[PDB]
Design a protein around this ligand. Structure first.
Ligand SMILES: NC(=O)N[C@@H](Cc1ccc(O)cc1)C(=O)O
Ligand SMILES: NC(=O)N[C@@H](Cc1ccc(O)cc1)C(=O)O
Ligand SMILES: [Cl-]
Ligand SMILES: [Zn+2]
Ligand SMILES: [Zn+2]
Ligand SMILES: [Zn+2]
Ligand SMILES: [Zn+2]
Lengths: 410, 410
């Protein structure tokens, strides 16, 4: 209640990691299994070892940095997030949670605090799902949602497989994925939504996570000349994609509040200015806090889209390339978080997470919750993503205390 | 009337060139200024020199192969097309006209025919405008529509410039672009439309070319998280693009008959599945045989599209990256072509060309017309583009006789 993390030390570690794999506007382009990700993992590794943590790496490249407890038989409390970013990443999505875990350890060392349960700072591979789909791939293997082989065979847009890239940057570890058992899992993360800033609250007590689908459409047209083909003879997969995006906007807007839909990825083949496309590939991202509502939006998109296509002579094929159902966080750990906020005198409210997180898969296999701090305009997945020294430190303080309650001081 | 070209020799030259830069389905991917194009140009060069033609090359890489006439004062009759293809090219778009020119020369040699006017077989650089926009770039320089510098600075999607690529494959010539004066220019080309096949006509007597615009849209959104951004806070340039494609389909359909509108090329940035795009870039291709109608479709697309975008918070920027006005071919050469068809006993009808061609720029600077043969289902810019030995030869015969009438036998 007096005991606080070092704000300047946390902040300084965030500005140092921001320099690894810079974007073009003061954010980060440090995507999974690139060289810059390798550099980021090594920097994090070295900081952690100077803090007395010992490293284990699983076959999905997930890094576990351990601070032993006083009971050698006791299961660990993990503090988790990701160091991998979007191509237009901010400095804080993922990174905040991992380096807050480090700061909590450093503070314990500064105060010579021992715990019953070990504490394990965790960096999951390919949270973002920008380079290889799905998102939360490593934590999904951990929870048994995906096989190792399935994960290894994911390809980026240049055709490189996840497995090979992991091996290339040198982070294929020896531990079986998901062989570690957790006593509890905590994730500190920026909100990525406008609510905490708009309501003037310092801490978000995360109760639930909204679920989502990634539906990948492959539409088949007929390559043909854009100048000499009569309109009544075109098989236009581009127009079909256009009508499908409009229909997604309608489904989302007919399902307010608590529903989003949209598309961020799109490919045309062969992508010539005077050739109607033979393939159009894109991903629809739909999400709701409410399972039945999410099921209903999916069924509907999947029924209406083939009819848009059939009206145009266009072939339509859909694959789920990502899926997380809504999650309810562990009520006991939710109280610990609220309690830590109150003990510390920090304004707080409950919150549903808008994004998915590795925490959502962690909750399959262990008591789990999350903590959020505010971010400016709820902007995230943009280089302009912004938090203050003061916001970051507040939530880290809450993380510190929640973890100590759960790991048990001696 | 007895004198016909060698159908097996023409056809065999088409099947030989088809083996250079193969596609993935028995067409061709032999785009401008690739190594495959270098190889195609060299094969054509060697066939022409075996036929006693002498070569000049301009600074745009256009190849002029000359057969002398007996009048020292007389300007040449050119036979023109292109050997460069789309990524999903057929074996016949462009190639038919260039190798028919060669076949006509070989037949003149076989019959020992001399002409008053010299004959110049012409292969123009970057007709297709698939790799570098605009289309008909070299012939455009020739007719004075584009500067040499502007042409050299065109970039492909990987950032290579036209100028450098021309130099690399070894086709930068020494002649000033457009220094040659032509007496007349003829282009034999497949129809790329269904009409000749459907009407059971062997020869298309081309009277006009429909004109067109390439309008390149750059839409500006805000990169944002596709799960955690509320719908009322998204600036969705993808949805804006979707509504613009639908508006184009409406403008085209409301301008029937004689209007086409469509999109073959599209880029999203940064093209991650969970990041709404910051940039969406695409090209709208609009065409009409009627100038006022084409003008009107452009004004309308250019007025309605910024309003679609402004309603979504999206910034809108439009640049013309290609333009040819409707062309009326030289009526005297049109009669020569009709006459050759009649002399030979080939069924014929008039046609407006759906595509643009180098012929359209040639017509700025010399009497010009085109000859078409049928193609199956009017399918073109597709590897499955199809003509028969019999169709190809008939139109070449008409080319031969039209050119002889115009160049004048001795
Ligand atoms: N904070 C963050 O990196 N989160 C990702 C993870 C995710 C993506 C798709 C999905 O279906 C479930 C989770 C995001 O929601 O974009
Ligand atoms: N041979 C061929 O396929 N021709 C091209 C040329 C063209 C392109 C754009 C334009 O505005 C005018 C002409 C096509 O029609 O796409
Ligand atoms: Cl090449
Ligand atoms: Zn995250
Ligand atoms: Zn993220
Ligand atoms: Zn052509
Ligand atoms: Zn073409």
């Amino acid at each position: 209640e007096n005991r606080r993390v070092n704000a300047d030390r946390l902040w300084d570690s965030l500005m140092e990691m921001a320099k690894i794999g810079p974007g073009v506007a003061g954010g980060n382009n440090r995507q999974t299994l690139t060289d810059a990700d390798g550099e980021g993992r090594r920097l994090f590794q070295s900081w952690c070892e100077e803090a007395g943590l010992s490293m284990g790496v699983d076959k999905m490249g997930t890094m576990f940095l351990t601070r032993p407890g006083t009971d050698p038989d006791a299961l660990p409390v993990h503090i988790g997030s990701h160091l991998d970013t979007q191509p237009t990443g901010g400095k804080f999505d993922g990174v905040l949670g991992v380096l807050s875990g480090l700061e909590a350890v450093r503070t314990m060392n500064d105060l010579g605090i021992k715990t019953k349960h070990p504490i394990v700072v965790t960096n999951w591979t390919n949270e973002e799902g920008a380079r290889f789909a799905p998102a939360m791939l490593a934590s999904g293997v951990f929870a048994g949602v995906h096989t190792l082989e399935y994960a290894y065979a994911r390809k980026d847009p240049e055709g490189k497989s996840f497995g090979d890239e992991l091996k290339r940057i040198g982070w294929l570890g020896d531990e079986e994925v998901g062989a570690r058992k957790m006593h509890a899992y905590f994730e500190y993360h920026i909100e990525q939504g406008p609510i905490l800033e708009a309501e003037n609250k310092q801490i978000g007590v995360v109760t639930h996570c909204q679920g989502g689908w990634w539906l990948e459409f492959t539409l088949t047209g007929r390559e043909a000349h854009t100048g000499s083909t009569p309109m009544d003879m075109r098989v236009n997969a581009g127009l079909a994609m256009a009508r499908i995006l409009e229909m997604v906007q309608t489904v989302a807007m007919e399902n307010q509040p608590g529903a989003v839909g949209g598309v961020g990825q799109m490919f045309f083949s062969p992508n010539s200015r005077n050739v109607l496309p033979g393939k159009v590939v894109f991903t629809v991202d739909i999400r709701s806090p409410d399972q039945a509502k999410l099921d209903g939006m999916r069924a509907r998109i999947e029924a209406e889209a083939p009819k848009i296509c059939e009206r145009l002579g266009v072939g339509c094929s859909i694959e789920a390339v990502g899926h997380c159902d809504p999650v309810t966080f562990d009520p006991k750990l939710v109280e610990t978080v609220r309690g830590a906020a109150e003990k510390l005198g920090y304004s707080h409210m409950n919150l549903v997470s808008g994004a998915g997180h590795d925490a959502c898969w962690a909750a399959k296999v262990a008591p789990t919750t999350m903590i959020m701090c505010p971010c400016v305009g709820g902007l995230s997945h943009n280089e302009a993503e912004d938090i203050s020294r003061e916001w970051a430190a507040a939530g880290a303080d809450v993380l510190f205390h929640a973890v100590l309650e759960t790991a048990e001081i001696v």
